[PDB]
Amino acid sequence: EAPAAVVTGAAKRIGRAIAVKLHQTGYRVVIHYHNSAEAAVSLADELNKERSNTAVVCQADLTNSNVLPASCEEIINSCFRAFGRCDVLVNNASAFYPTPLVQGKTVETQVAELIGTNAIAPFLLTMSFAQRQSNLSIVNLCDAMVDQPCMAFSLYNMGKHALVGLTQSAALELAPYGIRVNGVAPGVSLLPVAMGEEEKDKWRRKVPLGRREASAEQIADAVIFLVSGSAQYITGSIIKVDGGLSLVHA
Amino acid sequence: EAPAAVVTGAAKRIGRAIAVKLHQTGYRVVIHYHNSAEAAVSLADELNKERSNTAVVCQADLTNSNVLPASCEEIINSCFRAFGRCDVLVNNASAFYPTPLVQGKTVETQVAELIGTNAIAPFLLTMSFAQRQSNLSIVNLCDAMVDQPCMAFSLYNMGKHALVGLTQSAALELAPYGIRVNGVAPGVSLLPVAMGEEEKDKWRRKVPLGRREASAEQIADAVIFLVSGSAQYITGSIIKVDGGLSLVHA
Amino acid sequence: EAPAAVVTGAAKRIGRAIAVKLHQTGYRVVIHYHNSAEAAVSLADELNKERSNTAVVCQADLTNSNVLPASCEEIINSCFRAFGRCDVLVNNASAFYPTPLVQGKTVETQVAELIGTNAIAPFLLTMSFAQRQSNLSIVNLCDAMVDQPCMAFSLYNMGKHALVGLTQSAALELAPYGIRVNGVAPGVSLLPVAMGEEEKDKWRRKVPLGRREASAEQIADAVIFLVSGSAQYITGSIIKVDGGLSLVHA
Amino acid sequence: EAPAAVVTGAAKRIGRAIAVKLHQTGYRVVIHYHNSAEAAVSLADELNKERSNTAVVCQADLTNSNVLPASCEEIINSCFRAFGRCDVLVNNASAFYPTPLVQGKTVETQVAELIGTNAIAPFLLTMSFAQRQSNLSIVNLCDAMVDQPCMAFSLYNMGKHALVGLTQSAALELAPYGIRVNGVAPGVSLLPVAMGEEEKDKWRRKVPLGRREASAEQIADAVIFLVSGSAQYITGSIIKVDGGLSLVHA
Numbered sequence A, B, C, D: 001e002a003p004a005a006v007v008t009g010a011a012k013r014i015g016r017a018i019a020v021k022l023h024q025t026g027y028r029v030v031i032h033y034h035n036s037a038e039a040a041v042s043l044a045d046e047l048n049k050e051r052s053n054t055a056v057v058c059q060a061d062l063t064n065s066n067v068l069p070a071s072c073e074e075i076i077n078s079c080f081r082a083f084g085r086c087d088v089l090v091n092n093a094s095a096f097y098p099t100p101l102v103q104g105k106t107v108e109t110q111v112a113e114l115i116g117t118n119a120i121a122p123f124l125l126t127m128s129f130a131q132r133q134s135n136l137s138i139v140n141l142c143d144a145m146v147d148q149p150c151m152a153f154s155l156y157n158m159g160k161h162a163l164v165g166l167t168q169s170a171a172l173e174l175a176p177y178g179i180r181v182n183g184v185a186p187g188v189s190l191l192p193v194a195m196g197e198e199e200k201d202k203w204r205r206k207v208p209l210g211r212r213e214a215s216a217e218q219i220a221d222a223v224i225f226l227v228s229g230s231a232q233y234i235t236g237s238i239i240k241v242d243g244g245l246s247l248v249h250a
C-alpha cells in the first residue's frame, strides 16, 4: 500500500511542485486548495492519469476563525477517507502581503489571514494529523529571511516566526509517537505574480549562488529529503534553501 | 515634563516591578490590568502617594477578538489623556498554560488567549503607540527558553516566537521615527506561589548563576536599561536575563 | 566520468560511514587518516574490491603548525593526482576533550589540536580545494549542541563555533565559483570508546526521537543529500541530525 | 576600596571609551596596548590627573604563540600588582583584515593574529582572570554581523564566532564562581581610520536607527551596564548595539 500525503495550497507554484514530487516518489496525495479550483482539479487529473486513484482535491479556507479547527480536521479526514492513512503533512499554504504599522481589509481580518494561514492552521492540522494516528512526518514551509524581514510585513513575519516555534514544539512533543517535524525555509523562490520584471531582477541579483531564485522543484527536493528514510533521525530541523541569500549583509 | 509609560499586566509580579522601577526613574505610568483590579488600584495609590498625579489604571482583556484593536487604541489613548504623551510601551501581559497536541476551553479560545496576549495585543499596541506620535521605545517581554520549550506548550511558544518577530519587524519599521524596539527574555523568574517549594527547587537548581530564579526587580533592571539614554543605539535586541539557564543542555 | 571526494578522518566511525556512502553513490574517495593507517587501508581494500582503483589513502596530521598549510594542500592534491578532479570535501576530522578554565598537554598544544583540527585545517582545506578548481561542494561536520555546550569544553566549543563561521563565510565567498558550503550537525551519534555504558545510556534517554544515538549512517545520509543534485540551491545551511536533542531544556 | 578592571586594546577608539567610562564609574583601570604606547601613556596620565594612582598601562602582543599564555597571565597579574584585585576583564583588542580564500603575511601568521587576538587571547585571559580569584564579570567585544559576514573575512569571522562560543562556555563554567560572562556586539561603530568618507557614508546609510555609526560611548554604555549591579542575573548574553543593522536584508 502506497503512503499518503496532505499538501496545503497545492494547486499552484511551490505546493504544486511538492505534490508532484511526492506523487513521483510513490505517495497518494490530497491537493488542498482555497480559490484555485480549476488548477487543483487539473493537477489531480494529471496525477490520476499517471496512476488511478492516487490524487484527490480538498477545498478549505485556512483563515483563522472559530471553524478553522473543523476545517483542519476535515482536511486530515479527507486523506483517511480517500486513502485509509495519512503519513505526511506539508504545511505550505500562506498569505503574504504588507501590514504597515503606521498609516480594504480590517486589521482583524489581516491577523486572521496572515497568522491563520501561516501558523494557526499548521498548528490545528498538526493536532488533527497526530490525533488521527512506519515513517510519519510533517514539513512546514518557513522563511529563510525571518530575521532580516521585509519592511512593513510585521504580521507575515510574526506568523512565520510562530511557525518556527510550532516546528520545534511539535517535534519535541510528537517524537515519542514517531512523528518527525521539520521545516524548509526558502529565500527567494517563485516571485510574486503582481511584481514587475525590473524588481524581480533586483532580487535575483542579491542571491550569491547563481544570481537567480529557487525553482519550485528545488524547494520540493528538500521536502522530499525530509520525508524520506534518509532523514529518520532528523526532527526539529529547518533547512534553508536560499542560495546564500540570508548570509548577505545590507 | 516627566515622560510617561504604559505597562501591560502591571498589577502583579514582573509587570508591577517594571511599573515601580519606571516610576522611581521618573516616569508617569499607566498600570494596565485584566482581572487584578484591587492590586492595580493599590499600586496606583502607592505611586500617587509618592508623587501626586503620576499613576492611573486601565482595565482591558487582551485576548484576541473583533474589539481588541479598539481596546489597544484605548490603552494608548489613556496615557495621552492622563499625561499628554506616551514615551514608553512595555508589553508584559501574558497568558501561559499548556495546549497539548494529543488528547474547559475550546482550542480557538486558547488561540485567542495565548496568541492574543503574547503577540497580537503587542502588535496592536505597537501600531497605536507609533500612530499616536525625546527617547521613545518599546520593550517586549520575551522568553529565554523559546528554542528549548516546555513540553506541550506549543501555542504559548508560538506566541513568544511571534513576539520575537514583532520585536525585529517593528524595530526595522519604526527606526525612521526614532522609536527603538527591544526585548527582555527571562529564564525562570517568579515562580507560581502555589507551586510546591520542592517543585520550585527543581527549577532553581537548573540555573547556573546562583541556583535561584530571577527576581522581578532583576527583570525590571534590564527594561530600565533599554528605555534609558544608555541604550539609545540599541534596537531590535533581545537581552536574556536568565542566569545562564538557556545554555544548559538536557 | 565519476566524481571524487576527500573525507578527513575517514578510517573510523562517522568519517568511515561517510566514505562508504559516498563510494556507494558512485564517488571515488580519498580516505584521510592521521594515526589509523591499518583501518584506512582496510577501508580502501573493501571499496576497491567493490570497484577497482576507486579509493586511495592519505596520511596527514591536522594539528595546527607551520606545516599544516602544506599538509592540507597535499590532501587536496592527492585527490587530483589519483582521480583528476575533486568535487567534494568533507571536513569530518576532529579532536574532542575537555579544557577546564580553572585548574599532560600544554594549553597551546590543546589550542593547536582543538582549534587546529576542528577549524583551521577545514579553513586551509577549503582554501586549497577552491584554489585547485559540475556539482562542487564542501560539507563541514558541525555540532548540534554548539549553543548548549558540554561543561569544561570551551576550546572544543570555540572550534565548532569557528567552523560555523567558516561554513557561512566560505558559502558566501565561494558561491560565485559554484562551490556550495554546508554543514551537518550531529547531536549524540557514536559515543566515544572511552565513555562507560551507564554514561552512554544516560545520554540516550534524553533524545526525543527513540531514546537512542544516531548511527553513523544517519549522519552520512545528510552529507549525501547535501552533495547531491537535490541540494543544488542549498549553501550556508547547517542541517541538525540530533533526534531533537537540542530542543530539550535542562 | 575601588574595584579594578583590565581593558585590552584600550589606548584608542572603543577600548579607550570603555576604559574612560569604567574610570568615570569608579574603577581603577589597566590600559593594555600593543603598539600604541604614546596613546596609552597619554590616557593613563589623563586618568591619574583626575584621580591619582587609578590607571596603569600594560604592553602585550596578543597574537597566538607558545608565550601567549604567559602574556595573558601577566596582563591579569599587572592588575593585581597595581591595585590588589581584578574585578572586571574587557576583551576588546582585535585584529581585523581580509583573508581571501581564493588568490606580506604568511597564512599561519594571519591565523595567529586573527584567531589569537579575537579568540585565543580572550580564552587565556579568561583562564587567568578566573584562576587569580563582589561583582566579578567579563565582557567580550563581539560583532553583530557575525552571521552576515564581510566578503573575504573568513578568519576574522571564525575568530568572532569562536568568541561567541567562549562567551557561552565560560558563562556556564564560571557561573558557580560568581563570575558573569557576557558580550557586546557592535554593528558599525568607529569606522576604520584609513577608510575614506565616501565609503564611510555607504555604511552609515545602511543603519536604520539614525543612518549613522555607533559612537564609542554608545558601545561603552552597554559594557557599563553589563558590569553593573543592574545586570547581576545576566550571564551568557550578547547585547547587540547596532542601530538595527543586522535586521536589514540584502
Ligand SMILES: NC(=O)c1ccc[n+]([C@@H]2O[C@H](COP(=O)([O-])OP(=O)(O)OC[C@H]3O[C@@H](n4cnc5c(N)ncnc54)[C@H](OP(=O)(O)O)[C@@H]3O)[C@@H](O)[C@H]2O)c1
Binding pocket: A008, A009, A010, A011, A012, A013, A014, A015, A032, A033, A034, A035, A036, A037, A060, A061, A062, A063, A091, A092, A093, A094, A095, A096, A113, A117, A141, A142, A143, A144, A185, A186, A187, A188, A189, A190, A191
Ligand atoms: N515564493 C517564495 O519566494 C517564498 C519565500 C519564502 C517562503 N516561502 C514560503 O513557501 C510556501 C510556498 O510559497 P508560494 O510562493 O508557492 O506560496 P503562494 O503562491 O504565496 O501561496 C500558496 C497558496 O497558499 C494558499 N492560500 C493563501 N491564502 C489562503 C487561505 N486563506 N486559505 C487557504 N489557502 C490559502 C493559496 O491557495 P489558492 O491559490 O488555492 O487560493 C496559494 O496558492 C509559503 O509557505 C511561503 O510563505 C516562499
Ligand SMILES: NC(=O)c1ccc[n+]([C@@H]2O[C@H](COP(=O)([O-])OP(=O)(O)OC[C@H]3O[C@@H](n4cnc5c(N)ncnc54)[C@H](OP(=O)(O)O)[C@@H]3O)[C@@H](O)[C@H]2O)c1
Binding pocket: B008, B009, B010, B011, B012, B013, B014, B015, B032, B033, B034, B035, B036, B037, B060, B061, B062, B063, B091, B092, B093, B094, B095, B096, B113, B117, B141, B142, B143, B144, B185, B186, B187, B188, B189, B190, B191
Ligand atoms: N515568570 C517567569 O519565570 C517568566 C519566564 C519567562 C518569560 N516570562 C515573561 O515575563 C512576563 C511577565 O511574567 P509574569 O510571571 O509576571 O507573568 P504572569 O504573572 O503570568 O502574567 C502577567 C499578567 O498578564 C496579565 N494577563 C494574562 N492574561 C491576560 C488577558 N487575557 N488580558 C490581559 N492581561 C492578561 C494578567 O493580569 P491580571 O492579573 O490583571 O489579570 C497577569 O497578572 C510575561 O510576558 C512572561 O511570558 C516570565
Ligand SMILES: NC(=O)c1ccc[n+]([C@@H]2O[C@H](COP(=O)([O-])OP(=O)(O)OC[C@H]3O[C@@H](n4cnc5c(N)ncnc54)[C@H](OP(=O)(O)O)[C@@H]3O)[C@@H](O)[C@H]2O)c1
Binding pocket: C008, C009, C010, C011, C012, C013, C014, C015, C032, C033, C034, C035, C036, C037, C060, C061, C062, C063, C091, C092, C093, C094, C095, C096, C113, C117, C141, C142, C143, C144, C185, C186, C187, C188, C189, C190, C191
Ligand atoms: N560522534 C558524535 O556523537 C558527534 C557529535 C557531535 C559532533 N560530531 C562531529 O562529527 C565528526 C565525526 O565524529 P566522530 O565521533 O566520528 O569523530 P572522532 O572519532 O572523534 O574523530 C574522527 C577522526 O578524526 C581524526 N583526527 C583527530 N585528531 C586529529 C589530528 N590531530 N590530525 C588528523 N586527524 C585527526 C582521527 O583520525 P585517525 O584515527 O586516523 O587519527 C579520528 O579517527 C567530528 O567533526 C565531530 O566533532 C560527532
Ligand SMILES: NC(=O)c1ccc[n+]([C@@H]2O[C@H](COP(=O)([O-])OP(=O)(O)OC[C@H]3O[C@@H](n4cnc5c(N)ncnc54)[C@H](OP(=O)(O)O)[C@@H]3O)[C@@H](O)[C@H]2O)c1
Binding pocket: D008, D009, D010, D011, D012, D013, D014, D015, D032, D033, D034, D035, D036, D037, D060, D061, D062, D063, D091, D092, D093, D094, D095, D096, D113, D117, D141, D142, D143, D144, D185, D186, D187, D188, D189, D190, D191
Ligand atoms: N569598530 C567597529 O565598527 C566594530 C564593529 C564590530 C565589532 N567591533 C569590535 O569592537 C572592538 C573594538 O573595535 P575597535 O574598532 O575599537 O578596534 P580596533 O581599533 O580595530 O582595535 C583595537 C585595538 O586592538 C589592538 N590589537 C590589534 N592587534 C593586536 C595584537 N596582535 N596584540 C594586542 N593588541 C592588538 C590594537 O592595540 P594597539 O593600537 O595598541 O596596537 C588596537 O588599538 C573589537 O573587538 C572589534 O572587533 C568593532
Ligand SMILES: NC(=O)c1ccc2nc(N)sc2c1
Binding pocket: A094, A095, A096, A143, A187, A188, A189, A191, A192
Ligand atoms: N518574495 C519573497 O521573499 C517571498 C517571501 C515570502 C513569501 N510567502 C509567500 N506565500 S510568497 C512569498 C514571497
Ligand SMILES: NC(=O)c1ccc2nc(N)sc2c1
Binding pocket: B094, B095, B096, B143, B187, B188, B189
Ligand atoms: N516558569 C517559566 O519558565 C515561565 C515561562 C513563561 C511564563 N510566562 C508567563 N506569563 S509565566 C511564565 C513562566
Ligand SMILES: NC(=O)c1ccc2nc(N)sc2c1
Binding pocket: C094, C095, C096, C143, C187, C188, C189, C191, C192
Ligand atoms: N559525545 C558527544 O556528544 C560528542 C560530541 C562531539 C564530538 N566530537 C568528536 N570528535 S566525538 C564527539 C562526541
Ligand SMILES: NC(=O)c1ccc2nc(N)sc2c1
Binding pocket: D094, D095, D096, D143, D187, D188, D189, D191, D192
Ligand atoms: N567595519 C566593521 O563593521 C568592523 C567590524 C569589525 C571590526 N573589528 C575591528 N577590530 S574594527 C572593525 C570594524
